[PDB]
């Protein structure tokens, strides 16, 4: 029969990739700093001191970002999270020693987290600069206020959820989000800079690109930590903000993926086109692979996932026009840098789009009117 | 077929964190104070003590109101829900041992519950200052009766009724409701506040309000102590009281969604709107999402739930501007600060909702009239 | 001098108070 010559290539695919008899390991370097549960109130601290300094300088901030995400899951898990990723760890414990300086020939302690990734002498560099914007904060308001202060248990999450903002405009690859990353960081997150002068959205935000650029190793760690975060009972405030901007980055890398169905619910006549309708066969492959998938295919952009590619509706460019113009028509997309490789079906399916939002009459058959 | 392209990402990203490996643990502290039921008669004269004293600090009885809590819960049960939110719990027990201090000159014995919290030293000046007024009071009347007295079973509930109305008003998240808990405390419990000398709603919310901010554990320690304490036979009229003013707080942070079912119970026309009915596909989503999690979503607010933020119908601006405006105009809003993104909208629905509730006819057709 | 405040600090907190421990017994 005419009806058996086929062939699943989608699936067969999968199912090469999934039965590998052999595994790559790649360099995750020389070692890691996996702190435990004892010493996350310790990053939480120093978190704070970088948030109540005056202009302070983010250059270690995106890993000590890291540093609180892998703090808050526990040096157990944040070992077996790497481990699964596919990464050979040589694990660093991290926790508090005393160490004494004499700054300014005053002989000054300094409690001090002896990491590889980050020096005592950045640290202590770090608790300095705090000190200084804290006395002049206390001259200004007289008694500091228990938001304004760095012991506020808010610090950690506050400078990940810029780090959430980061993870969700990593689809393009190349920092070109960064604008929307701090315009959101202004319209989210308002209050929390008021009661920080360190909390600086473009500081922050190109220190954690510089660290999941520099280490991939860590945004796969950030992403399932955010996931284990978002999976907990309830918590304040700020891990609500931090919970909801996380969410914002599932489906990221395939927004042409949801515009699809955008276009399908919206009913553009584009769709039903002759040359359109030749790619439904294959289009309905990716999105019931989608629907295979399920959850876990929110993430396959910004974690550089191989099978992120099989989720690409560009390999069908007739349905790829369509979907892009209809988001023209309904004036969604810009400025996304996405490109029609049909151009005719592009400015019919716009064309069509632009007459479906016109005017707003009343529907009444949809209300229970007896 | 252009029906099989869709993507449930609701129940996709529910999947993702509903199926998380890996687990984060927040700092919870040092230790936790996790009383028995053998305590929870002392800690209940503790709580009376407060309630006797005239012009009484209440700087400690947001602590001491979950200390009675987590005595009514018991070490194992209390111990189960801290660990069940997600917190590392180092549990300190609770017992009464006799402290002997001469105040005045005069040794004189206190029975002290030795806490982590709460110091012997200032447990000793609640009893110091109850007795004071409870010779004033008994100067007064000459035999304070069962009701006045800090023996009354009722102390121990009747402090935790206004962490129920400070609970109530938990979902602003800035200390603004205050006002509304002081008055409902008047309104409500008003026969409490006669037989009470130091029951102030101002005074003892302000410490619920310090206690829950200070330490969101406790907050998910009330709330499972509230529902288990709904989930008795039967009680007092105290406990009956607070199993009322505690289910108030049922549906917190999410009254868009129940004044967008009274906008369709009442058919307001701005519902069959071009705008608003281009929503209507994603707002079903949001609606079946919280009636398939339940009474679960009761308290996703209230206690700062990740998955909060998928309750929300402020993603849709067309269909909350007209469920907004139906409330306007039923006038049942004020002082309520949600803004309509849809200004023309939201009039339109102000305009219609006014019209509905003018005069008032006998409807004849709805009675058995023969 | 660290290790034994720490430990005097949580020795403190186990000899604190005295509840009933009912699994103990063989209550039927």
Same mark, same amino acid.
């Given at each position: 029969a005419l009806s058996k010559v086929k062939l699943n290539d989608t699936l067969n695919k999968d199912q090469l990739l999934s039965s590998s008899k052999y595994t790559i390991q790649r360099s995750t370097g020389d070692s890691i700093d996996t702190p435990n549960y004892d010493v996350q109130k310790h990053i939480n601290k120093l978190c704070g001191m970088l948030l109540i300094t005056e202009d302070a300088n983010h250059k270690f901030t995106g890993l000590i970002g890291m540093l609180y995400a892998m703090s808050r899951l %526990?040096?157990?898990?944040?070992?077996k999270i790497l481990r699964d990723a596919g990464y050979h760890v040589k694990a660093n414990g991290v926790d508090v020693t005393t160490h004494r300086q004499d700054i300014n020939g005053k002989e000054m302690k300094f409690e001090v987290l002896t990491l590889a990734s980050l020096t005592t002498e950045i640290q202590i560099n770090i608790e300095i600069e705090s000190r200084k914007s804290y006395k002049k904060m206390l001259k200004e308001m007289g008694e500091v206020a228990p938001e304004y202060r760095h012991d506020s248990p808010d610090c950690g999450m506050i400078i990940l959820c810029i780090a959430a903002l980061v993870i969700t405009k990593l689809a393009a690859g190349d920092r070109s989000g960064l604008t929307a990353v701090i315009r959101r960081a202004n319209?989210?997150?308002?209050?929390?800079?008021?009661?920080?002068?360190?909390?600086?959205?473009?500081?922050?935000?190109?220190?954690? @690109?510089?660290?999941?650029?520099?280490?991939?190793?860590?945004i796969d760690v950030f992403v399932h930590f955010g996931i284990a975060q978002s999976s907990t009972r309830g918590g304040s405030r700020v891990e609500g903000i931090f919970a909801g901007l996380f969410m914002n980055a599932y489906g990221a890398g395939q927004v042409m993926l949801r515009w699809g169905v955008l276009a399908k619910s919206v009913k553009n006549i584009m769709l039903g086109h002759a040359s359109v309708q030749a790619e439904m066969e294959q289009v309905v492959e990716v @999105?019931?692979?989608?629907?295979?998938?399920? %959850?876990?295919?929110?993430? @396959?952009?910004?974690?550089?996932?191989?099978?992120?590619?099989?989720?690409?509706?560009?390999q069908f460019p007739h349905f790829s026009s369509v979907v892009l113009g209809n988001a023209?028509?309904?004036?969604?997309?810009?400025?996304?840098? %996405?490109?029609?490789?049909?151009?005719?079906? @592009?400015?019919?399916?716009?064309?069509?789009?632009?007459q479906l939002k016109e005017n707003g009459v009343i529907n009444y058959s949809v209300l229970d009117l007896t």
């Amino acid at each position: 029969a005419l009806s058996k010559v086929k062939l699943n290539d989608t699936l067969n695919k999968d199912q090469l990739l999934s039965s590998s008899k052999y595994t790559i390991q790649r360099s995750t370097g020389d070692s890691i700093d996996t702190p435990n549960y004892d010493v996350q109130k310790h990053i939480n601290k120093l978190c704070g001191m970088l948030l109540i300094t005056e202009d302070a300088n983010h250059k270690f901030t995106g890993l000590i970002g890291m540093l609180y995400a892998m703090s808050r899951l %526990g040096r157990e898990d944040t070992i077996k999270i790497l481990r699964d990723a596919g990464y050979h760890v040589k694990a660093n414990g991290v926790d508090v020693t005393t160490h004494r300086q004499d700054i300014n020939g005053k002989e000054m302690k300094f409690e001090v987290l002896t990491l590889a990734s980050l020096t005592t002498e950045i640290q202590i560099n770090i608790e300095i600069e705090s000190r200084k914007s804290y006395k002049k904060m206390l001259k200004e308001m007289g008694e500091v206020a228990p938001e304004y202060r760095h012991d506020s248990p808010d610090c950690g999450m506050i400078i990940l959820c810029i780090a959430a903002l980061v993870i969700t405009k990593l689809a393009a690859g190349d920092r070109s989000g960064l604008t929307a990353v701090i315009r959101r960081a202004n319209n989210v997150l308002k209050n929390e800079m008021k009661r920080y002068k360190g909390l600086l959205p473009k500081d922050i935000a190109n220190s954690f @690109y510089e660290v999941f650029e520099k280490h991939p190793h860590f945004i796969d760690v950030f992403v399932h930590f955010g996931i284990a975060q978002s999976s907990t009972r309830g918590g304040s405030r700020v891990e609500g903000i931090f919970a909801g901007l996380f969410m914002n980055a599932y489906g990221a890398g395939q927004v042409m993926l949801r515009w699809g169905v955008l276009a399908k619910s919206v009913k553009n006549i584009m769709l039903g086109h002759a040359s359109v309708q030749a790619e439904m066969e294959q289009v309905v492959e990716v @999105y019931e692979y989608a629907q295979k998938l399920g %959850g876990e295919a929110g993430f @396959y952009h910004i974690l550089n996932n191989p099978k992120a590619s099989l989720l690409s509706l560009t390999q069908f460019p007739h349905f790829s026009s369509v979907v892009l113009g209809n988001a023209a028509g309904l004036g969604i997309m810009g400025e996304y840098r %996405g490109t029609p490789r049909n151009q005719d079906l @592009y400015d019919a399916a716009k064309a069509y789009a632009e007459q479906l939002k016109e005017n707003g009459v009343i529907n009444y058959s949809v209300l229970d009117l007896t």
